UniProtKB/Swiss-Prot annotation, chain A:
The gene is glnR. This is HTH-type transcriptional regulator GlnR. Transcription repressor that represses many genes including ureABC and tnrA, during nitrogen excess. On the contrary of the MerR members, which require longer DNA sites for high-affinity binding, GlnR requires a DNA sequence of 17 nucleotides as minimal binding site. Homodimer under conditions of nitrogen excess. Monomer under conditions of nitrogen-limited. Interacts with feedback-inhibited GlnA in order to stabilizes GlnR-DNA complex. Disruption phenotype: In vivo, this mutant constitutively represses glnR expression. In vitro, this mutant binds DNA more tightly than wild-type and this binding is not activated by feedback-inhibited GlnA.
Curated annotation (Swiss-Prot), chain B:
Disruption phenotype: In vivo, this mutant constitutively represses glnR expression. In vitro, this mutant binds DNA more tightly than wild-type and this binding is not activated by feedback-inhibited GlnA. Transcription repressor that represses many genes including ureABC and tnrA, during nitrogen excess. On the contrary of the MerR members, which require longer DNA sites for high-affinity binding, GlnR requires a DNA sequence of 17 nucleotides as minimal binding site. Under conditions of nitrogen excess, the DNA binding activity of GlnR is activated by a transient interaction with feedback-inhibited GlnA. Under conditions of nitrogen-limited, GlnR is autoinhibited by its C-terminal region. It comes from Bacillus subtilis (strain 168). This is HTH-type transcriptional regulator GlnR. GO terms for molecular function: DNA binding; DNA-binding transcription factor activity; identical protein binding. The keyword Transmembrane does not apply. Residues 14-33 bind DNA. The chain holds residues 1 to 84 of 135 of the full protein. The lineage of its organism: Bacteria, Bacillati, Bacillota, Bacilli, Bacillales. Residues 11-79 form the HTH merR-type domain. Homodimer under conditions of nitrogen excess. Monomer under conditions of nitrogen-limited. Interacts with feedback-inhibited GlnA in order to stabilizes GlnR-DNA complex. One of its GO terms (biological process) is negative regulation of DNA-templated transcription.
DNA sequence: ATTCTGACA
DNA sequence: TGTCAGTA
């Protein structure tokens, strides 16, 4: 689908992503290091997130607020990719 | 489908369940405190688990071993029960 | 013997 | 969660 390719185009910088998700750059990096999201990189090596990335990050923020731990986050996001 | 009635049928007590799921009574009862399971009761308030409860209990064990906490499991089971 | 609820040297 | 307690 042209949709999935659109939802995957990397274009969002860490700056807005932090404002919207309310996550620290540190946390964002952490979820990336755990394979939860996959932000490509520019020429300046700056991170560029995709819509699916930001969408998942908003979900991570939400699960955190509900008390879900890292293990939970992983299971859920994984079972979402399998849906 | 006279199977569901048999699966939702109270047959074994906490002690047998422990043997079928390798879960302690503390754990088994604890998951109940979180609304994860709804075991039927007898006249003596003794829990009688059905086949459905044991299955739903094996699921919890899998996640529990995966490091998922109660909040995580509530979140997971909540969806796995509304989709199918 | 077996399970139950509450509680924490 | 373990576990000891005091029952039912």
């Amino acid at each position: 689908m042209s949709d999935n390719i659109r939802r995957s185009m990397p274009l969002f910088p860490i700056g807005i992503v932090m404002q919207l998700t309310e996550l620290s750059a540190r946390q964002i990096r952490y979820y990336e290091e755990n394979g939860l999201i996959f932000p490509a990189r520019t020429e300046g090596n700056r991170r560029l997130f995709s819509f699916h990335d930001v969408d998942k990050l908003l979900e991570i923020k939400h699960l955190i607020e509900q008390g879900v731990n890292m293990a939970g986050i992983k299971q859920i996001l994984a079972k979402a990719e399998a849906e």
